[PDB]
Write a protein that binds this ligand. Sequence first.
Ligand code: CHL
Ligand code: CHL
Ligand code: CHL
Ligand code: CLA
Ligand code: CLA
Ligand SMILES: CC(/C=C/C=C(C)/C=C/[C@@]12O[C@]1(C)C[C@@H](O)CC2(C)C)=C\C=C\C=C(C)\C=C\C=C(C)\C=C\[C@@]12O[C@]1(C)C[C@@H](O)CC2(C)C
Ligand SMILES: CC(/C=C/C=C(C)/C=C/[C@@]12O[C@]1(C)C[C@@H](O)CC2(C)C)=C\C=C\C=C(C)\C=C\C=C(C)\C=C\[C@@]12O[C@]1(C)C[C@@H](O)CC2(C)C
Lengths: 230, 227, 213
Amino acid sequence: SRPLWLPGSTPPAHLKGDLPGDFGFDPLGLGANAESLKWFKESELVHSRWAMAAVAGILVQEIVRPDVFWYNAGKEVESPLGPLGLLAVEFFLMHWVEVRRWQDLRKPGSVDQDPIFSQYKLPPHEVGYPGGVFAPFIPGDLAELKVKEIKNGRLAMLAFVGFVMAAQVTGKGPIAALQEHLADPWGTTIFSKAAVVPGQAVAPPCKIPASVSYKGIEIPTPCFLQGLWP
Amino acid sequence: DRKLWAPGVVAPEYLKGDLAGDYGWDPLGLGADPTALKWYRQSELQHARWAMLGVAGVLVQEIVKPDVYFYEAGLPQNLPEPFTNINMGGLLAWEFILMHWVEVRRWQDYKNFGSVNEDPIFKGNKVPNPEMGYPGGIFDPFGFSKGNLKELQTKEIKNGRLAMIAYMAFILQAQATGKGPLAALSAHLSNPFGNNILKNIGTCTVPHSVDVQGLTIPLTCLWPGSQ
Amino acid sequence: VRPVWFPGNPPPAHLDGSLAGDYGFDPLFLGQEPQTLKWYVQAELVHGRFAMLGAAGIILTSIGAKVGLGFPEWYDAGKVVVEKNNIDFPTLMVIQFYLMGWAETKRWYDFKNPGSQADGSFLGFTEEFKGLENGYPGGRFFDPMGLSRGDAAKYQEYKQKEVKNGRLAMIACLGFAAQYAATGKGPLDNLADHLADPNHVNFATNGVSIPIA
Ligand code: CHL
Ligand code: CHL
Ligand code: CHL
Ligand code: CLA
Ligand code: CLA
Ligand SMILES: CC(/C=C/C=C(C)/C=C/[C@@]12O[C@]1(C)C[C@@H](O)CC2(C)C)=C\C=C\C=C(C)\C=C\C=C(C)\C=C\[C@@]12O[C@]1(C)C[C@@H](O)CC2(C)C
Ligand SMILES: CC(/C=C/C=C(C)/C=C/[C@@]12O[C@]1(C)C[C@@H](O)CC2(C)C)=C\C=C\C=C(C)\C=C\C=C(C)\C=C\[C@@]12O[C@]1(C)C[C@@H](O)CC2(C)C
């Protein structure tokens, strides 16, 4: 009745199309439990929203600041606030924000009131979709917008993972790697730099240094599951 | 009343001539399960159709390019000038992506008949798909399906079965004699008695392994022939 | 009806197919008594679950060794970890038996008196230790994703999958030990040798398994 991930298939019983982006994909049945789906619904939005912001940032960094490698931005960046000064502000600010979001997930409608200012309050809303101050402007129908958000978000989540493995294998940024693909599309695919057959296995070399020296300490920098690479 | 594979042999109950090219031949009784018979029928069509392309390719390629020795044609250095020494990794990438799409579409048709007839991108386009394994429509531009379809199915499977046997003759002959199909045929005519299977059967001419752009690929013959 | 380990042999009376992975294999009638069968059903799962962790760990580290990442073989990891990290073996052993003893004693008295560990005695937790079946704790701690609280049909399918991968892992862990004793090389070192020359490199030619060879 609705488009599915695999056309012609029957969606699992626990999936019925109520949620946005519900295309009936759940081969392992992780969403069968009602409470588990409610939690997994929140994490998908949070993961997607973080990924979209992260993917946009990495692309903009390379265009604006081509010299700096987004992978090495952790050590490359220098600021007066120092390493542990930045972390301190980040921890406390994120601890407040995340706990309040977490509380609404458990008991919705309890953390809508503004603590400091009495008059201001968050209108009634659904879990994971705060309104009011967070949404000053809405281009159109929310139902359509929610589907747009998740579909772009799901793509962004894959996009970020593409950056990491491309960065670890090719040792380059996202746009820089793409330019390499366009130069020699046949000789740059993962098939054209790695292969495993009975008796032999060839894998790309991890182009990220094993360890990083950062202000008198050594930070391990391992390639993700480098032993299982193709 | 149809003729059977052997004289005076009783055909299995589940083989009653519904399918084309039905001689009532199933010594292992693999078609007893009705669902299994459908799947095996599809694989017979796939082997039949791929094998016919394989036989045609080997023979035609031999005529146009006698020296290529199709058995070795897979090596990158033997490819035509435009594609000579192409990166096999990138070349495989095209086939995997394109074949994965096409074959999953065919597979989904078997799982749920008639579900994948319509074009996904351009709405409206469809194929008739009168029977599983016979999409028709765009796959039959000349419209030969119209008419005596049953007879055409019989002709397809009978020729396809012959191709399967014929192609594996090419492979074993190349492994034993080291020559292509037409080349081996000429050799037999020259010296029918001196040059035949009785002599060549004991030798396997395939090297143990080959190096394809730095990757070692194991190779084997279909019998423990004297290397 | 249902398949059995020895085709044509009727299954034993005490094995009725209700349990997961039941193929009517009990030639010595070790589980004829119903109460003893409960004990062994859980013993098999604990053995199977540990073997799966052991086999996966041994395989993964062996891949690290072959690829050159520097991992030691499973039969040398214990010595390497202790020496490289400067760990007192007797202290590490004692810590293990405190943590295993507490966790595994709780599993022991849940078998004796089911539901006894969910009385709130342990830090006030009253529902995470109740238990679903014999050998299947369930709950939001041991089953955080709630795959045992969703579809009932698929949960029974997983129980079949868990036991069979567990039995396969148990056999594999015996293979690692037997292969090391016969060959003295790592797991994947043996696999590489077999793929090189399968005909002339296997147990029938190692000079140990078949002494009359
Ligand atoms: C119908 C398909 C097909 C057939 C029949 C052949 C047949 C042949 N090719 Mg050719 N090729 C085929 C497709 C292709 N070849 C090549 C590329 C090559 C090369 C580069 C070479 C050959 C060679 C050979 C020979 C292999 C002898 C042997 O024992 O191999 C079988 C050996 C094996 C190790 C594989 C046996 C198992 C099975 C066939 C593969 C299945 C793999 C699974 C999909 C992997 C799945 C992994 C899991 C984890 C998901 C033989 C003449 C060799 C040759 O000319 O030798 C003189 C050679 O060097 N082929 C490509 C890439 C474009 C193909 C793409 O479809
Ligand atoms: C989403 C978060 C995040 C991610 C994905 C990365 C990712 C990366 N950083 Mg970056 N960083 C992140 C946040 C931060 N980094 C830094 C500071 C640095 C530095 C100084 C360096 C990197 C480096 C790297 C790279 C290698 C990482 C590695 O191998 O670590 C291996 C693993 C670890 C070192 C520890 C892992 C910790 C664990 C995942 C989470 C721990 C949680 C805390 C205990 C909870 C309390 C903290 C609060 C904030 C929640 C990689 C691209 C390195 C680089 O450039 O390599 C080329 C590098 O030198 N990052 C800061 C500022 C404090 C961050 C703040 O959020
Ligand atoms: C009369 C004494 C007495 C005895 C012999 C026991 C014996 C036992 N009690 Mg205990 N209890 C006793 C009194 C009491 N118990 C309880 C309440 C409970 C509960 C609720 C439970 C037990 C359990 C157990 C068993 C734990 C088995 C094990 O391996 O523990 C291993 C021991 C430990 C892990 C803790 C001790 C570790 C070490 C010796 C001390 C370390 C201290 C350091 C500060 C550590 C710091 C490390 C950090 C920094 C990394 C064991 C049979 C458990 C059990 O098995 O129940 C079925 C259980 O759940 N008892 C109360 C309160 C009413 C008691 C009051 O007198
Ligand atoms: C997940 C988000 C994220 C993270 C963690 C980073 C992290 C980083 N960025 Mg990137 N960036 C992002 C998103 C992100 N960026 C996005 C979305 C964009 C497009 C607008 C950019 C554009 C960008 C540029 C152009 C540059 C960086 C740079 C940097 C580095 C230094 C930052 C600095 O000095 O700030 C100092 C901080 C300030 C001066 C004040 C910032 C105040 C902000 C705007 C408040 C935003 C609040 C708002 C509620 C956030 C909503 C989204 C959020 C929830 C994800 C650092 C590695 C620099 C770099 O490459 O260094 C090597 C750099 O030049 N980023
Ligand atoms: C029971 C049948 C049988 C068996 C078990 C063997 C066993 C063996 N043969 Mg012998 N062989 C046989 C029959 C058999 N042969 C016959 C009938 C012929 C005449 C065609 C030969 C001709 C022959 C040669 C030329 C060589 C061997 C060799 C070998 C060795 C294996 C390597 C090899 O290349 O074999 C290849 C052999 C075959 C593929 C024959 C398969 C026969 C099948 C199993 C029986 C049915 C055949 C059927 C009637 C069709 C016959 C041909 C047809 C045109 C009429 C091995 C000791 C090799 C050797 O001496 O190594 C030191 C070797 O070089 N055999
Ligand atoms: C698909 C196939 C061949 C495909 C070949 C292709 C694509 C070749 C391509 C290329 O060559 C070219 C063109 C040019 C070269 O340069 C490159 C390559 C790539 C090499 C053969 C199948 C070949 C398939 C064969 C031979 C199958 C035979 C099956 C039989 C006899 C089964 C019999 C029974 O099962 C029944 C039916 C019923 C039971 O009751 C009883 C028993 C007896 C068990
Ligand atoms: C084979 C086995 C049991 C087999 C039992 C059989 C056939 C029983 C058969 C029968 O009884 C039946 C059913 C019914 C009866 O009527 C008849 C018989 C015939 C009597 C158990 C293996 C059980 C195997 C187990 C539990 C293995 C656990 C392994 C672990 C934890 C390994 C850990 C580590 O390897 C790491 C990960 C990293 C390393 O560096 C360090 C170490 C510590 C080595």
